[PDB]
Write a protein that binds this ligand. Structure first.
Ligand code: NA
Length: 229
């Protein structure tokens, strides 16, 4: 019983860490302007939120209206900050193991293409990540949670989607994997913010929810793709 031929990875939260860095920028920019919020609140409600929606949130939940220089200073600091993106603990090891085993894999991300490659570069994963790296410009803009990106990724590997496992840390990305016909394994490495929690991924339909790259490799070995410890 070999369930899988190939692995499809999300980027943010699974291979690289960036949500944490961006939350820290929101926190310091607001703090300097009077408002002190917890990183968990910032990650939960500001992430993937549009700027006017953040403004609405701040007014509604915190009676707060940032001063005029808010937009200008945030974009400055968000830019200086992309620099500090790091690899997720054990991600390089998982990519190295799949490569040594000859297991096909691809990366699918909603990031704009330049940003996608920038993050892999600064995290030191460019060489390990390989050549199958897809952002929504490859599928006409129809990014996650549409299945298109993962359908396309599987096609490029020459593998049926139903024979892929998708490694995701959000309902947005996990739904794209499931809608493509793949199996979903959630991966929620602790100490890093993720858009959704384990219960939400399980309810969505994740076959399992893993908590470390070491756990991921062990599961992959159980599935016949890697060699067990
Ligand atoms: Na993600």
């Amino acid at each position: 019983d070999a369930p899988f031929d190939a692995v499809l990875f999300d980027l943010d939260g699974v291979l690289v860490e960036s949500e944490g860095i961006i939350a820290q920028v929101w926190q310091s920019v607001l703090a300097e302007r009077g408002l002190h919020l917890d990183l968990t609140e910032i990650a939960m409600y500001f992430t993937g939120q549009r700027f006017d929606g953040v403004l609405a949130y701040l007014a509604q939940q915190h009676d707060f209206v940032p001063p005029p220089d808010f937009l200008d200073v945030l974009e400055t600091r968000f830019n200086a900050a992309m620099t500090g993106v790091t690899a997720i603990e054990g991600a390089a090891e998982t990519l190295r193991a799949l490569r040594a085993a000859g297991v096909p894999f691809a990366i699918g991300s909603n990031s704009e293409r330049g940003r996608l490659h920038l993050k892999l570069r600064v995290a030191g994963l460019t060489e390990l990540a390989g050549e199958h790296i897809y952002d929504p410009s490859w599928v006409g803009g129809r990014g996650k949670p549409h299945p298109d990106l993962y359908t396309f990724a599987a096609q490029q590997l020459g593998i049926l989607p139903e024979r892929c496992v998708v490694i995701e840390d959000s309902v947005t990305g996990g739904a794209a994997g499931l809608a493509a016909g793949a199996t979903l394994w959630g991966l929620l490495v602790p100490g890093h913010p993720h858009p959704d929690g384990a219960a939400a991924l399980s309810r969505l339909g994740a076959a399992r929810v893993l908590t470390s790259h070491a756990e991921l490799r062990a599961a992959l070995a159980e599935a016949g793709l890697l060699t067990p410890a």
